């Protein structure tokens, strides 16, 4: 009954209370109540899908305008109202975001529309990405052939679009759900080998945190080494490659935090003398779309593969907190 709708609104409220002011929390919940006023759940339901979408956004510390727009999904094209959002308390920005998202809902023409919307207001893409994340979760009921078709569209379009707009955690989560729906047996085989080798890979990761710390000391570079999770990279690799348990146990990801760009360049030079450079990417000189900067280097010490992300203290706080 309405006890599901009102219980969902309180779940959203638990997320927005910590970072959004009470005046803004009033506005977001007002949109939620308006979304339900327009809607009668006749379609196998939907007010709760937009609330579940808005909860994903609320968890990413999204602004109140983006959250109201998510809640008012399909309210001006599917409901008996239009331009009602501007007239309502919601206002122009919300009506604009609402329309923008319905516009994004003919192969090449779709790609143009997605790209264009990114340059207009990335918040339209951020809402679209949360909506596709929520769909990947609720894909279970569908036939295995259909599930792998939606998963493939998400893999090709939404996973790279999410990295492009800076939402890398959201992209890793989306990519994970894609592999699950593309080939469940392959996902299960690889997740099992990852679980099996987890204790030993953690033991060698601590060893390499010490080896890298010793290298910084030997080469006279001041830094911090942070252990990084790399489950998605191992999964991405072994879903398309034969299993090798020594290679799976000895692959580690790290974040090295330095003081200066001169030290970042000084570290890459030192690493080149002690390892085989498999891959290198300079995002300091050529920042990623969205301003984030780092040097990415993939190394091959005998048996061990290391995936490093070299950054300064400042570059790290700009990337983590804007």
Of 77, 153, 188, 313, which is the active-site residue? 77
308 to each of 79, 212, 267, 296, 311, how far by Cα in Å? 50, 10, 11, 6, 10
Q: Are residues 176 and 188 in the same domain?
A: no
Give the number of residues written for the chain. 322
Q: Establish whether 77 is a catalytic residue.
A: yes
Find the domain containing 139 and state its range.
1-183
Question: What is the resolution in angstroms?
Answer: 2.8
State the angle between helix axes of 261-274 and 184-218 in degrees (0 to 180), rounded to the nearest 10.
100
| 50 is a domain residue | yes
How far apart, in whole angstroms, are the C-alpha atoms of residue 83 and residue 105?
18
Asked if 190 and 257 sit in the same domain, the reply is yes
Active-site annotation holder among 4, 33, 78, 169: 78
Tokens of 171: 């992209």
Q: Is 132 annotated as a binding residue?
A: no
Do 189 and 160 lie in one domain? The reply is no
Q: Are residues 224 and 282 in the same domain?
A: yes
In a domain, 46, yes or no: yes
- The CA-CA-CA angle for residues 75, 77, 78, to 5°, reads 70
* Domain identity same for 4 and 67: yes
Please list the alpha-helical segments (H only) found in the chain.
2-16, 22-38, 48-59, 64-71, 84-87, 92-103, 108-120, 122-137, 144-153, 159-164, 168-182, 184-218, 231-238, 245-249, 261-274, 313-321
131 is in an annotated binding site: yes
The last residue of a domain, from among 168, 183, 198:
183
Q: Is residue 118 part of a domain?
A: yes
Cβ–Cβ < 8 Å for 197, 245 = yes
Kindly report the backbone phi and psi dihedral angles of residue 107, in degrees, each rounded to the nearest multiple of 5, phi listed first: -85, -50
Is position 73 annotated in a ligand binding site? yes
* Cα 8 from chain centroid (whole Å): 23
Provide φ and ψ at 39, rounded to 5°. -90, 130
Same domain, 169 and 46: yes
Among 78, 200, 52, which Cα is nearest to 131's? 52
Q: Is residue 17 part of a domain?
A: yes
Per the annotation, does 224 bind a ligand?
A: yes
The answer to whether residues 12 and 106 belong to one domain is: yes
The answer to whether residue 30 is domain-embedded is: yes
Tell me how the structure was determined. X-ray
The residues pairing with 298 across neighbouring beta strands, listed in sequence order, are: 279, 307
Q: 3-state SS of 197-237?
A: HHHHHHHHHHHHHHHHHHHHHHCCCCCEEEEECCHHHHHHH
* Cα angle, residue 36 at apex, residues 30 and 39 outer, rounded to 5°: 145
Q: Count how many Cα atoms sit within 13 Å of the Cα of residue 92 in the half-sphere of its side chain.
A: 0
In this structure, the answer to whether residues 39 and 171 fall within a common structural domain is yes
| Number of domains observed in the structure of the chain | 2
289 belongs to a structural domain: yes
Do 215 and 286 fall into the same domain? yes
The answer to whether the beta carbons of residues 60 and 170 sit under 8 Å apart is: yes
């Amino acid at each position: 009954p309405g006890e599901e709708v009102s219980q969902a609104k309180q779940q959203l409220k638990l997320i927005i209370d910590p970072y959004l002011s009470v005046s803004e929390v009033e506005k977001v919940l007002a949109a939620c109540d308006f979304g339900d006023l327009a809607h009668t759940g006749i379609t196998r339901k939907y007010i709760l899908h937009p609330i579940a979408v808005s909860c994903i956004l609320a968890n990413m510390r999204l602004d109140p305008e983006t959250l109201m727009a998510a809640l008012l999904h399909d309210v001006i094209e599917d409901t008996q109202y239009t331009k009602d959002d501007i007239i309502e308390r919601f206002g122009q920005t919300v009506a604009e975001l609402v329309d923008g998202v319905t516009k994004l809902s003919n192969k090449a023409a779709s790609f143009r529309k997605i790209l264009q919307a990114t340059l207009q207001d990335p918040r339209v893409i951020i809402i679209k990405l949360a909506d596709r994340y929520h769909n990947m979760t609720t894909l279970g009921a569908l036939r295995p052939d259909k599930r792998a078709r939606i998963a493939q569209e998400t893999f090709d379009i939404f996973v790279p679009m999410a990295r492009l707009v800076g939402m890398n955690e959201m992209a890793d989560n989306l990519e994970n759900l894609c592999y699950q729906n593309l080939d469940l047996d392959m996902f299960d085989n690889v997740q099992n080998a990852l679980l099996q080798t987890k204790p030993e890979r953690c033991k060698y990761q601590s060893i390499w945190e010490q080896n890298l710390a010793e290298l910084l000391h030997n080469y006279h570079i001041q830094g911090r080494i942070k252990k990084k999770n790399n489950n998605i990279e191992l999964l991405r690799h072994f879903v398309k490659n034969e299993m090798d348990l020594q290679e799976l146990t000895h692959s580690h990801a790290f974040e090295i935090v330095l003081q200066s760009i001169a030290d970042c360049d000084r570290l890459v030079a030192a690493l080149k003398e002690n390892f085989q450079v498999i891959q290198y990417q300079d995002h300091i000189r050529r920042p990623l779309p969205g301003g984030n900067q780092s040097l990415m280097i993939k190394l091959k010490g005998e048996k061990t593969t290391l995936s490093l992300t070299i950054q300064t203290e400042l570059m790290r706080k700009a990337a983590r907190f804007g």
